[PDB]
């Protein structure tokens, strides 16, 4: 017992490579990735024309067990918070039922906190670092190919004040917490992008992250299905066929949030937090945080 865990891995790098290799075998496009030059008329930029097919991508809960002469050590501390000496801990043969969901700014169909809202970051001080948020209760986000995603207005405004009850200041006794939206960047980054029913959705979320804190009203989010996307696997671009179904319908459970904080206002009265995402590793990290691989004889 009395062991160490952190914002490093277990299966973060492993899983990432399994999922990248899983997507490849499943959602086949017509790829285009950039290998950089040298000169003299010789300059690569690989384009690949595969028989772009209309398949359906479905998530299979992936269990990660002990790798060779190693052992998985699950931290049982109900509220383990990232890095630190886990007190209550035990060896396990496999982690748990991890659903590999690829998506941005909103972690979906995953593990919730059993106690209170728990946030985690490598360095809560460096504004450049992603802050992951594990939610208390699940929220629903129903979406369709028809361009929209609606989530309960009350359910989500509540989770916001909960997350607000602990931002950057570090569960700060108090100050003004502000939720604004993305500053800019790729479409996959600026919007809640995810793969719904095989298709790629780009849901405009300004309405989820635009507030201030210290009957059947639903939050309707405009959404768009794009065919040309910037890859998350590696720095590339890809194009998929247009939809064939006229009833693309998903129902996911927001289980988290991946944020970022505005800077140049260190320790002052207000702290702005905007949605984030992009590094799919930060998606595996939210599920694998409580695990670690130790060499066994």
């Amino acid at each position, epitope marked *: 017992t009395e062991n160490f865990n952190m914002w490093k891995n277990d299966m973060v790098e492993q899983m990432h490579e399994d999922i990248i290799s899983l997507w490849d075998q499943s959602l086949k496009p017509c790829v285009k990735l950039t290998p950089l030059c040298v000169g003299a008329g010789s300059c690569n930029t690989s384009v690949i*024309t595969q028989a772009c097919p209309k398949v359906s991508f479905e998530p299979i809960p992936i269990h990660y067990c002990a790798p060779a002469g190693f052992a998985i050590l699950k931290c049982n501390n109900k509220t383990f918070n990232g890095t630190g000496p886990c007190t209550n801990v035990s060896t396990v043969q496999c982690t748990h039922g991890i659903r590999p969901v690829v998506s941005t700014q909103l972690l979906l169909n995953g593990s919730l906190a059993e106690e209170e809202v728990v946030i985690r970051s490598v360095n809560f001080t460096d504004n450049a670092k992603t802050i992951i948020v594990q939610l208390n209760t699940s929220v629903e986000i129903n979406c369709t190919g028809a361009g929209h995603c609606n989530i309960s207005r009350a359910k989500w405004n509540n989770t916001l004040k909960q997350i607000a009850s602990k931002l950057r200041e570090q569960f700060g006794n108090n100050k003004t917490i502000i939720f604004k939206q993305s500053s800019g960047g790729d479409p996959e980054i600026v919007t809640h992008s995810f793969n719904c029913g095989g298709e790629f959705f780009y849901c405009n979320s300004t309405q989820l992250f635009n507030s201030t804190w210290f009957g059947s009203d639903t939050i309707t989010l405009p959404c768009r299905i794009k*065919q040309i996307i910037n890859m998350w696997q590696k720095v590339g671009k890809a194009m998929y066929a247009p939809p064939i179904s006229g009833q693309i319908r998903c129902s996911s459970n927001i289980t988290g949030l991946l944020l970022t904080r505005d800077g140049g206002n260190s320790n002052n009265e207000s702290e702005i937090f905007r949605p984030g995402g992009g590094d799919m590793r930060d998606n595996w990290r939210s599920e694998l945080y409580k695990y670690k691989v130790v060499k066994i004889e």
Partner: antibody, heavy 128, light 110 residues
Framework: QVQLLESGAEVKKPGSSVKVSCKASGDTFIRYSFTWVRQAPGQGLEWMGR????????HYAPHLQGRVTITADKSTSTVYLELRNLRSDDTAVYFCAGVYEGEADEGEYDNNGFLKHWGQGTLVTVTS | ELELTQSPATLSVSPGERATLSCRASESVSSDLAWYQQKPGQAPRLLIYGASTRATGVPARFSGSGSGAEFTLTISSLQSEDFAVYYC???????????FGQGTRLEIKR
């Protein structure tokens, strides 16, 4: 709605390289994909190839592959078709065509295979 | 590798009457069929696409029907403007290997 205008006629000896242009105007060039259709004197239409103007990836017909090349200059809204190793049988009228997809930083792209706009035609005669 | 064929090589119809041309395929094209009209020395005119949807400025006169490997192009009231050769083109396959038919010649019968 684009307006496709092509280069004048070409007279080439067999074995030469020809590059015909197609100035696209009137509509956001990138949001369209251009194809080249050739037509020999008393024959019909023949698909040679098509370029996806947003990605710059062309897919040619399995018979022209190797000696045909389509490019689009996004700064001059100009499509191109180079045909090398000219055989006398390459003597025909080369039309550039196109349809609208919808991209231009939207990610949308139908990849419509049909052709809505065409050009006046460029006669290319190849003879000794 | 889709081989397209338009059945009546030449169709002779009296002006004002109705005309119907067929376009078969060796493999299934699944609705990705088009129809073009070509006057003598003029670039082709896109009449129909997606097997049955007519293009902007194409009279109800012309009609597109069919799926799989057999299509038809009906022109009810044949005017004089409708003198031309008609071509059908499939574009189902990927990578693109879209093909044309050898055309049907639509002339005036007298």
């Amino acid at each position: 709605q684009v307006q496709l205008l092509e280069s004048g006629a070409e007279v080439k000896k067999p074995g030469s390289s020809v590059k015909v242009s197609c100035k696209a105007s009137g509509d956001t060039f990138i949001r369209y994909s251009f194809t080249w259709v050739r037509q020999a004197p008393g024959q019909g239409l023949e698909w040679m190839g098509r370029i996806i103007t947003i990605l710059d990836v062309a897919h040619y017909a399995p018979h022209l592959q190797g000696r045909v090349t389509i490019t689009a200059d996004k700064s001059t809204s100009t499509v191109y078709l180079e045909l090398r190793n000219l055989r006398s049988d390459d003597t025909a009228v080369y039309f550039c065509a196109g349809v609208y997809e919808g991209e231009a930083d939207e990610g949308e792209y139908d990849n419509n295979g049909f052709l809505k706009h065409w050009g006046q035609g460029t006669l290319v005669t190849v003879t000794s | 590798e889709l081989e397209l064929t338009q059945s009546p090589a030449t169709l002779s119809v009296s002006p004002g009457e109705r005309a119907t041309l067929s376009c078969r395929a060796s493999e299934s094209v699944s609705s990705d069929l088009a129809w073009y009209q070509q006057k003598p020395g003029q670039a082709p005119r896109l009449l129909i696409y997606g097997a049955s949807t007519r293009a902007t400025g194409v009279p109800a006169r012309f009609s597109g029907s069919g799926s799989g490997a057999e299509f038809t192009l009906t022109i009810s009231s044949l005017q004089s403007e409708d003198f031309a050769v008609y071509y059908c083109q499939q574009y189902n396959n990927w990578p693109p290997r879209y093909t044309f038919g050898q055309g049907t010649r639509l002339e005036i019968k007298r």
